[PDB]
Write an enzyme that holds these catalytic residues in place. Structure first.
Site, mmCIF file in Angstrom:
data_model
loop_
_atom_site.group_PDB
_atom_site.id
_atom_site.type_symbol
_atom_site.label_atom_id
_atom_site.label_comp_id
_atom_site.label_asym_id
_atom_site.label_seq_id
_atom_site.Cartn_x
_atom_site.Cartn_y
_atom_site.Cartn_z
ATOM 1 C CD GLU A 57 -1.453 2.234 2.113
ATOM 2 O OE1 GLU A 57 -0.782 2.164 2.807
ATOM 3 O OE2 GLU A 57 -2.281 3.280 1.557
ATOM 4 C CG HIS A 58 3.602 2.416 2.947
ATOM 5 N ND1 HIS A 58 2.592 1.880 3.444
ATOM 6 C CD2 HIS A 58 3.868 3.577 3.766
ATOM 7 C CE1 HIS A 58 2.272 2.223 4.735
ATOM 8 N NE2 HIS A 58 3.166 3.346 4.599
ATOM 9 C CD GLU A 92 4.020 4.205 8.398
ATOM 10 O OE1 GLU A 92 3.059 5.184 8.277
ATOM 11 O OE2 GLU A 92 3.930 3.230 7.782
#
Ligand SMILES: CCCCCCCCCCCCCCCCCC(=O)OC[C@H](COP(=O)([O-])OCC(O)COP(=O)([O-])OC[C@@H](COC(=O)CCCCCCCCCCCCCCCCC)OC(=O)CCCCCCCCCCCCCCCCC)OC(=O)CCCCCCCCCCCCCCCCC
Lengths: 403, 76
Positions: free
Chosen positions: A51-52, A128
């Protein structure tokens, strides 16, 4: 008078669903039945890391030129991943409908994962996560999932453990991509100013290449004590019914009845024939036990002493809710993608209204006694949680001696 | 009271529901080894005082008897 959601199917199995409306901007998305539940602890962060990587360039559109295209029409590009579903959606104008679909086609197939990018996105993801711990409610809900679904693929988080994040390679990703991105497990959903025949022709033109190929709740407790935090977050849940079980609607009405702690939120998270139904509250240490007592009393009242007025209020809150949501294009497309992935069809709002109006007080307290009364909960606490009661007191608060 | 008892940090604590776990997991499986483990860490501190109590008690009894037993040499 709400327009119906029309669903077609390509040979690939990619159901192309659309719900036209006057609004001239549309939310076209791709919904994939692939999440952290389909990962096998050796690729626990593959969906998140893909997804990144999915917006960092494809084979046909190498690098930032791709996102230059989605800047050129002024469109917005979003993606998210849950434990069961992955979504890539674009909000754009109506007249830019073809190229957007073509863009989405690249994002699902022909995507390019650059090794250079892999290291950069690893540092992004790693960092993150290294700071994600900051968000308490996310920590508490991850703890609740882990302690409620111990030993299953539903305990593991969407992000995965830092370990896997560091230890991931293109080929692994390629696998997850080539394994969980099958055409029969994909929905192309469109909401707003779109024509269904034009969208079907665009899905036939591009995206017609996508290849065609025991969940358990454990009544338990995790307590992360860290007394330096100013506030405590506590989530208590029981096992939910699942997506396809209609009494979910009744349970939603029960949540609408509940709606002492600074923040009190009720949730009904549903996965494929399982789920978590409960409450999360964030409180000062010296109040925690009283909150819990309060909360458990309300649940037992809904199991024993539900009246017609609060049921009517909960039905009105639910109706307004579902209809307040499902308002903007995105919210809708999102509903089309989840409805085709979970139910296999788009449930119209009239059927939702019928299932709401058939709910009365007697079946609400029956279903609440079926799902809340004398059940073993999953408890997840984070913060100054010493006065949070242990499992015997919560388990004893899950029933009444007077019924 | 609870909430103001102590300050700990970063100590996660997992647990299970009573009905979800076996009541007597490996009760005699490890119970015996443990009970035996326990007895061998405390037997040398506990037992020898009571052993010499038993010896002193017997001794006293027998000595007392001998004391009571008539002196044959006496009265002859
Ligand atoms: C030895 C063979 C059995 C064995 O190996 O099992 C392992 C087990 C030892 O397990 P462990 O992992 O070492 O310790 C955890 C205990 O089992 C955890 O259990 P516990 O033994 O600590 O239980 C608490 C304790 C609490 O004891 C009391 O309440 C004592 C109260 C005061 C004394 C009694 C009042 C009168 C005093 C007059 C003097 O209750 C007992 O002492 C046993 C009660 C048995 C009731 C009858 C069951 C049939 O052995 C026993 O439990 C012995 C007691 C039961 C027999």
């Amino acid at each position: 008078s709400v327009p119906e959601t029309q669903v077609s199917i390509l040979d690939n199995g990619l159901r192309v669903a659309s719900e036209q409306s006057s609004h001239a901007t549309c939310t076209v998305g791709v919904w994939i039945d692939a999440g952290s539940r389909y990962e096998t602890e050796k690729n626990n962060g593959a969906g998140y890391f893909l997804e990144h990587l999915a917006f960092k360039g494809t084979k046909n559109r190498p690098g930032n030129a791709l996102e230059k295209e989605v800047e050129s029409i002024g469109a917005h590009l979003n993606a998210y991943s849950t434990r069961e579903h992955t979504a890539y959606l674009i909000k754009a104008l109506s007249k830019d409908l073809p190229k957007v679909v073509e863009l989405l086609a690249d994002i699902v197939q022909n995507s390019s994962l650059e090794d250079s990018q892999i290291e950069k996105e690893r540092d992004v993801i790693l960092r993150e996560m290294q700071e994600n711990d900051a968000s308490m409610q996310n920590v508490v809900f991850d703890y609740l999932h882990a302690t409620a679904f111990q030993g299953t693929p539903l305990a593991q988080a969407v992000e995965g453990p830092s370990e896997n994040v560091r230890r991931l390679s293109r080929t692994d990703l390629t696998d997850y991509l080539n394994r969980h991105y099958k055409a029969p497990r994909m929905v192309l959903a469109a909401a707003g100013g779109v024509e269904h025949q034009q969208l079907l022709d665009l899905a036939q033109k591009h995206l017609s290449s996508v290849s065609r190929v025991p969940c358990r709740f454990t009544g338990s407790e995790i307590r992360h004590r860290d007394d330096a935090l100013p506030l405590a977050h506590v989530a208590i849940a029981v096992e939910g019914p699942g997506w396809a079980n209609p009494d979910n609607v009744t349970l939603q009405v029960a949540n609408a009845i509940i709606g002492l702690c600074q923040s009190f939120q009720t949730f009904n998270i549903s996965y494929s024939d399982t789920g978590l139904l409960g409450a999360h509250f964030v409180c000062d240490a010296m109040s925690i036990d009283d909150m819990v007592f309060f909360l458990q009393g309300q649940w037992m009242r809904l199991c024993t002493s539900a009246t017609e007025s609060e049921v009517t209020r909960g039905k009105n809150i639910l109706r307004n809710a579902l209809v307040s949501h499902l308002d903007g294009t995105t919210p809708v497309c999102e509903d089309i993608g989840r409805s085709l992935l979970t139910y296999g069809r788009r449930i119209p709002l009239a059927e939702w209204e019928s299932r709401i109006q058939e709910v009365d007080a007697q079946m609400l307290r029956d279903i609440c006694s079926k799902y809340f009364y004398d059940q073993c909960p999953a408890v997840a606490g984070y913060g100054p949680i010493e006065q949070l009661p242990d499992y015997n007191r919560i388990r004893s608060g899950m029933f009444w001696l007077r019924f | 009271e609870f909430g103001n008892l102590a300050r700990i940090r970063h100590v996660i604590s997992y647990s299970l529901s009573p009905f979800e776990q076996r009541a007597f997991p490996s009760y005699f499986s490890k119970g015996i080894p443990n009970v035996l483990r326990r007895t061998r860490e405390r037997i040398l501190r506990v037992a020898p005082p009571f052993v010499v109590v038993y010896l002193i008690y017997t001794w006293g009894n027998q000595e007392f008897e001998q004391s009571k037993r008539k002196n044959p040499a006496m009265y002859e």
